[PDB]
């Protein structure tokens, strides 16, 4: 009934969308506009072949992007673009500049407290969600897969009617919201906003996925994450999850080759070399040094902060950079409980700590694992030598 269709035109400010459009290269503009004219046509007179040769002759003459953008916004579709095109431009923006966007994780659970591995056919999900949402708000939903990851991404935008205006009859836009689904995992990723519209959305996804048994979403983290690649690496269905930090090589899994591999090149015959540790604390006490031992000291720091001598990803940049972490140690001394709460901030906390270790301000052998980066992206409390994620 209230489900929208692709030919409707919303209202918004032209300059903002112009600035959004200016981000894109010329070639993608050409492709997008050819497709738009192919599907919808336009106010311009002439066949698409005529449009094709005009756009061509425009580009081989080396015209600037401003001319094409002005054409799109003022002659081809002067009254405004469709909702489909508005969604498409944001899709391309996200794909081109992933690091500009933030996400939060959410875990799907069923009645008995077990993880619910969500498996999704897009058609049933999209139709059910559209029908559920349309009863409350006018909703347009666009769904697509990331070009380079196994994730399905959805863009949800809500509209409402009209400050004062006469019988123009447009619907004013609003800030969009995003959700993503890995193929086989209990986890959900979504944008960071707590307005009631986002709550309505997330509730609608939770309602519609179920279809055979009840489902509920339980947040697992309170601080957002950027760059969908990173959050996919941290919590998506993968080998790196629960093998982060010093434990990355098992996720890599290239150290070991299959058993039938040749004998003489099986690494066991050939071996490797490593450095001996020192345990009597001479760190605080105190160039009179030589290259090799210093090299292996740097390798020791590398592995303690990266997990591999070659340093599987500068020498300090980490796999997934972390911007904020808050820890809280709880230790018992003389039947008295003592609290220390460390707070770090930056672009890569553990890379900075690694740099300080290289400058010899911190003793490597006394850096705990939770400080080294394991349990990555999780702030939490450590009791009895066991990390515990904050509630």
């Amino acid at each position: 009934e209230l489900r929208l269709e692709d030919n409707y035109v919303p209202t918004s400010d032209t300059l903002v969308v112009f600035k959004q459009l200016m981000k894109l290269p010329v070639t993608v503009l050409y492709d997008l506009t050819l497709s738009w004219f192919a599907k919808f046509g336009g106010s311009f007179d002439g066949d698409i072949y005529l449009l094709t040769e005009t756009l061509d002759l425009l580009i081989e003459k080396g015209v600037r992007r401003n001319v094409i953008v002005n054409r799109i916004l003022y002659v081809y579709w002067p009254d405004g673009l469709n909702v489909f095109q508005l969604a498409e431009i944001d899709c391309h923006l996200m794909i081109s500049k992933p690091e500009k966007f933030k996400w939060l994780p959410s875990k799907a659970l069923r009645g008995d407290g077990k993880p619910y591995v969500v498996k999704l056919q897009p058609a049933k999900f999209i139709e059910n969600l559209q029908t559920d949402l349309a009863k409350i708000y006018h909703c347009h939903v666009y769904m697509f897969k990331h070009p380079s990851l196994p994730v399905l991404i959805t863009r949800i935008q809500l509209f409402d009617s009209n400050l004062d205006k006469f019988q123009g009859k447009p619907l004013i836009s609003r800030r969009p919201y995003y959700v993503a689904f890995p193929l086989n995992s209990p986890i959900i990723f979504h944008s960071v906003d707590k307005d009631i519209y986002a709550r309505l959305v997330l509730q609608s996804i939770s309602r519609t996925i179920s279809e055979r048994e009840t489902i509920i979403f339980k947040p697992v983290q309170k601080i957002p994450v950027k760059s969908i690649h990173n959050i996919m690496t941290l919590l998506g269905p993968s080998r790196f999850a629960e093998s982060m930090g010093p434990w990355e090589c098992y996720a890599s899994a290239n150290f070991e080759r299959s058993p039938l591999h040749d004998y003489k090149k099986h690494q066991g015959l050939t071996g490797k070399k490593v450095m001996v540790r020192e345990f009597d604390d001479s760190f605080l006490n105190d160039g009179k040094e030589e290259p090799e031992i210093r090299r292996l000291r740097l390798e020791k720091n590398m592995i303690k902060f990266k997990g591999s001598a070659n340093g599987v990803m500068s020498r300090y940049s980490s796999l997934v950079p972390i911007e904020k972490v808050g820890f809280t140690l709880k230790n018992e001394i003389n039947s008295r409980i003592i609290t220390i709460k460390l707070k770090f901030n930056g672009n890569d906390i553990f890379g900075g700590l690694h740099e300080l270790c290289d400058k010899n301000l911190i003793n490597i052998d006394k850096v705990p694992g939770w400080l080294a980066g394991e349990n990555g992206s999780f702030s939490g409390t450590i009791m009895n030598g066991d990390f515990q994620r904050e509630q």
Partner: protein, 100 residues
């Protein structure tokens, strides 16, 4: 618009609780236990007469295991490697070697 979202959230919250699962599991356990008590009392009385029930006949044999038992026994007996004849040949040759 606020109220509808609130009530929907409550609806989702109710059915995922631990207690809702625990009560059903407990009820299933109660049913199993009472059925077991019924059956045990019935069969021990049947063993001891004074039964006042049926539990004492084989008019049908839809559910049975004697088939697999019987054929496994035979396959063990007819085994061309462990059969009784293979056995007796081995022991006969051993006894012949012992005697000569």
């Amino acid at each position: 618009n606020q109220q509808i979202i609130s009530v929907r959230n409550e609806i989702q919250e109710l059915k995922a609780g631990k207690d809702w699962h625990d009560l059903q599991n407990e009820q299933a356990k109660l049913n199993d236990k009472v059925k077991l008590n019924k059956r045990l009392n019935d069969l021990t009385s049947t063993l001891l007469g004074k039964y006042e029930g049926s539990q004492d006949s084989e008019d049908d044999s839809i559910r049975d295991d004697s088939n697999i038992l019987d054929i496994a026994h035979f396959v063990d007996l007819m085994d061309p490697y462990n059969g009784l004849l293979k056995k007796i040949n081995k022991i006969n040759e051993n006894l012949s070697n012992e005697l000569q």
